[PDB]
Amino acid sequence: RGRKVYFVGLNEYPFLPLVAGLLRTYAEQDERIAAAYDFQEPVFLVAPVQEMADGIVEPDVLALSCYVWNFRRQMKVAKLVKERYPNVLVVAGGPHVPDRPGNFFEKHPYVDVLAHGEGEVAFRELLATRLSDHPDYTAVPGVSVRRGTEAVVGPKAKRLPRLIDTPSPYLLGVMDGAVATCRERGLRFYALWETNRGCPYSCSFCDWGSATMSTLRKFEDERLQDEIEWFARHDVEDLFICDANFGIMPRDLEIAHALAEARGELGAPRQVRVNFAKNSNDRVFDISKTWHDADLLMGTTLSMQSTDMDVLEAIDRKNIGLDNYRKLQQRYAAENIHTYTELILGLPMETARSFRDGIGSLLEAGNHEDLRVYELGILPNAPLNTPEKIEQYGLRTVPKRMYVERPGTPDDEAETFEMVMETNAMPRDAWVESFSFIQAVQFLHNGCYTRYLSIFLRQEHGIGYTRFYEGLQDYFTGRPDTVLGALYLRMRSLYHDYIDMPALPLANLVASQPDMAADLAPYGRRRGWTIDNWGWLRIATDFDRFHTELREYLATLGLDARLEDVLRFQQDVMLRPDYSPELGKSAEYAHDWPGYFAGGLLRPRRVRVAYGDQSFGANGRYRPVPGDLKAFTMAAIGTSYPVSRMGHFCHRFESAEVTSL
Ligand code: B12
Numbered sequence: 001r002g003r004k005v006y007f008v009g010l011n012e013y014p015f016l017p018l019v020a021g022l023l024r025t026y027a028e029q030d031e032r033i034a035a036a037y038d039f040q041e042p043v044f045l046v047a048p049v050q051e052m053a054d055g056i057v058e059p060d061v062l063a064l065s066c067y068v069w070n071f072r073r074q075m076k077v078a079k080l081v082k083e084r085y086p087n088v089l090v091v092a093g094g095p096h097v098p099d100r101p102g103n104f105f106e107k108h109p110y111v112d113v114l115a116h117g118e119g120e121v122a123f124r125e126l127l128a129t130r131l132s133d134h135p136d137y138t139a140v141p142g143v144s145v146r147r148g149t150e151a152v153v154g155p156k157a158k159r160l161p162r163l164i165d166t167p168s169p170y171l172l173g174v175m176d177g178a179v180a181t182c183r184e185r186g187l188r189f190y191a192l193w194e195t196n197r198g199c200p201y202s203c204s205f206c207d208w209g210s211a212t213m214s215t216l217r218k219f220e221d222e223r224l225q226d227e228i229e230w231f232a233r234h235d236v237e238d239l240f241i242c243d244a245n246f247g248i249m250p251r252d253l254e255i256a257h258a259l260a261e262a263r264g265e266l267g268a269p270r271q272v273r274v275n276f277a278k279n280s281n282d283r284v285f286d287i288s289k290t291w292h293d294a295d296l297l298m299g300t301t302l303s304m305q306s307t308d309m310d311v312l313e314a315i316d317r318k319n320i321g322l323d324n325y326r327k328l329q330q331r332y333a334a335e336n337i338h339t340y341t342e343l344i345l346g347l348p349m350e351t352a353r354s355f356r357d358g359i360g361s362l363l364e365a366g367n368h369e370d371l372r373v374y375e376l377g378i379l380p381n382a383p384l385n386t387p388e389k390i391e392q393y394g395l396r397t398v399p400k401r402m403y404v405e406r407p408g409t410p411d412d413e414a415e416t417f418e419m420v421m422e423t424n425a426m427p428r429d430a431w432v433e434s435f436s437f438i439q440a441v442q443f444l445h446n447g448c449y450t451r452y453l454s455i456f457l458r459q460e461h462g463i464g465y466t467r468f469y470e471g472l473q474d475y476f477t478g479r480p481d482t483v484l485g486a487l488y489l490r491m492r493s494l495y496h497d498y499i500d501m502p503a504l505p506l507a508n509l510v511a512s513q514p515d516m517a518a519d520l521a522p523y524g525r526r527r528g529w530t531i532d533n534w535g536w537l538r539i540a541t542d543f544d545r546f547h548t549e550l551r552e553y554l555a556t557l558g559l560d561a562r563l564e565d566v567l568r569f570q571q572d573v574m575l576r577p578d579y580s581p582e583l584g585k586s587a588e589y590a591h592d593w594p595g596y597f598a599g600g601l602l603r604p605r606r607v608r609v610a611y612g613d614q615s616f617g618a619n620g621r622y623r624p625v626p627g628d629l630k631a632f633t634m635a636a637i638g639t640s641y642p643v644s645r646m647g648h649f650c651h652r653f654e655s656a657e658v659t660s661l
């Protein structure tokens, strides 16, 4: 027995309950807490709200770890649990808890305590104070306490020191049950891991770890090494490191080598996801090379958010120079180390013009493989979320639902994301056009369908990358019956419905549309199809017509045997459903295109190219099977989550044999 403590921190994808384990093991250092409280297995997998609430039996404390993806459902769980147990202490923490609660407890009178920011100290003090004959919640630092419906702000939060020396839930065995649950249910999952806390920078849109603009604090060395071995010994294939700037600290290289050696010795992890440092440096490169050799790498972060000087000044971000970015791209490409760059659509002062020009400048600098875009969200505690900032830049938002809602689910259970869809610099019509533009760049250029053609036209015919993809959108949007035109127009109407119908889900957008879901059904059953997944597969379905219609657009540019030759190469290099790894795939060309796109001089040299790819995707785990459309989809585009941009879309030259004729 004892006072039962329930943790709830759910998400649609399985992530081990790190928060619950951290708070529990830190609090249990108090012998009174360890003796009096009976900590329950954390709830982290999604279930119907009523089922989840029914699973909480005689709770003394209900602890909710609240993010944008679970706030509404966890408030509903608390409401139902509070109804049945009037004396349960409901405490909510996490970055969706507002720093300034205001009228929070009027809207959520079933919540009793709000924890602000890092929660170890406050949670331990809460549980300790609850054991007293006269609990004094108004002395607990870093919390706000409900009195009636008023929020009584407690003393300022206390944080852990520069060297964080706290218990590890992994090493203490309290994460064993969560792994077992995932494995019992056959679920792929991520283990969460922190090596430090904080980001030293100040991007106004961001709320990373509730600790931007902060002095960095490190978890102790020995704990981290023990945890690396724990992950490896428990065959955790997928590791998610939460650091804001991996590579920013000298020891990050030693951590990277330790993970590579763990993979070599124990077979795990196989994939490590992490955000790499903003001010990318030699250490980031050394880490990426180490993980490339061990096949742990999921892509080196070289993110920009925006490239426009006024936008960056408005959001308090300094990027590396465009020429330094180009030099980085060359260095990584020479080692075949995958990089990626993120942009945010709708940032303060960003126009459709600057948005498209920035994208083109990134391709110009050498980013052809991985460009990612996110709709700007107003996070509760980001510096950008003030009435003054929103008014100054004219930010207009809609409460955007995140997921498709099963029929019969009450509307107060739908998670919402405060999404910007219009600014003073970007009207909503231009927002829609800009969103479609970069989606097309993703499935056409990153997706390879026109990447080599575009590079050839840029380097031999002076057709700029922005010009090329702007021309595609202008030309084909006026031609509704072409393959590409149908895609542009479907995206235009989708993204206008996306704004006008806040219920259309951010994370299941394709799946929410019956016609788009029907188009992808032969390729697989997924809730998480992305727009660029859908675009890539739609072209795969009508591949031959796509290329005949592409010729007509090329005529409008003033554009020949060499162009005819590179078009055949651009057609053959794409992965197709009939590809057989046993037989391979070969063709003959008037030029050595593999040598050219690897940096060589373009020469009229007749060559035979024989592609012999055996597998695709992360760790080469997807093997094509001719005629099997499901197997083709996995090899071509991988999983929708995690994002699959390494070893996909097209046949690779490293596996190709080029012989002279
Ligand atoms: C891993 C991760 C994910 C995972 C989900 C992880 C999960 N299910 O738990 C995935 C990859 C799915 C994800 C997605 C997104 N994410 Co994310 N993600 C993170 C990341 C890197 C780590 C979260 C984590 O576990 N941290 C480690 C834990 C230990 O720390 P913590 O969250 O700070 O917890 C402490 C305090 O909050 C407090 N606390 C927390 N819970 C509780 C509970 C109680 C009772 C108490 C007392 C205290 C308390 O104590 C903890 C320990 O000190 C964070 C950034 C970060 N470093 O925190 C962003 C972050 C959570 N993501 C964010 C965003 C915006 C998103 C997206 C929604 C949008 C995007 N990125 O473009 C997308 C999803 C979009 C879509 N669906 O298409 C924001 C969320 C802000 C918010 N208000 O929710 C963050 C903070 C990053 C940012 N940009 O500022 N995310």
Ligand SMILES: CC(C)(CO)[C@@H](O)C(=O)NCCC(=O)NCCS[C@@H]1C[C@H]2CC(=O)N2[C@@H]1C(=O)O
Pocket (backbone or CB within 6 Å): 012, 013, 273, 275, 403, 507, 508, 527, 528, 641, 642, 643
């Ligand atoms: C089927 C679902 C879609 C639920 O209906 C389920 O599969 C799910 O919810 N899946 C997570 C999808 C997701 O969160 N996508 C966002 C893009 S990626 C994510 C954010 C980007 C920057 C950073 O650090 N990353 C993270 C990463 O790269 O992991």
Ligand SMILES: C[C@H]1O[C@@H](n2cnc3c(N)ncnc32)[C@H](O)[C@@H]1O
Pocket (backbone or CB within 6 Å): 205, 206, 207, 275, 303, 305, 342, 343, 344, 374, 375, 376, 377, 378, 379
């Ligand atoms: C980790 C990545 O998450 C993105 N990111 C961070 N904060 C936000 C936000 N408020 N809205 C959208 N995307 C965001 C940035 O592109 C960053 O590089």
Ligand code: MET
Pocket (backbone or CB within 6 Å): 208, 243, 244, 245, 275, 276, 277, 278, 279, 301, 302, 303, 304
């Ligand atoms: C975690 S955000 C992405 C990585 C890095 N901090 C950047 O902004 O470039």
Ligand code: SF4
Pocket (backbone or CB within 6 Å): 199, 200, 201, 202, 203, 206, 207, 208, 212, 244, 245, 278
């Ligand atoms: S975007 Fe990256 S650099 Fe900027 S505040 Fe967030 S974590 Fe720090």
Ligand SMILES: [K+]
Pocket (backbone or CB within 6 Å): 210, 211, 212, 381
């Ligand atoms: K803050």
Ligand SMILES: [K+]
Pocket (backbone or CB within 6 Å): 249, 250, 251, 252
């Ligand atoms: K260090």
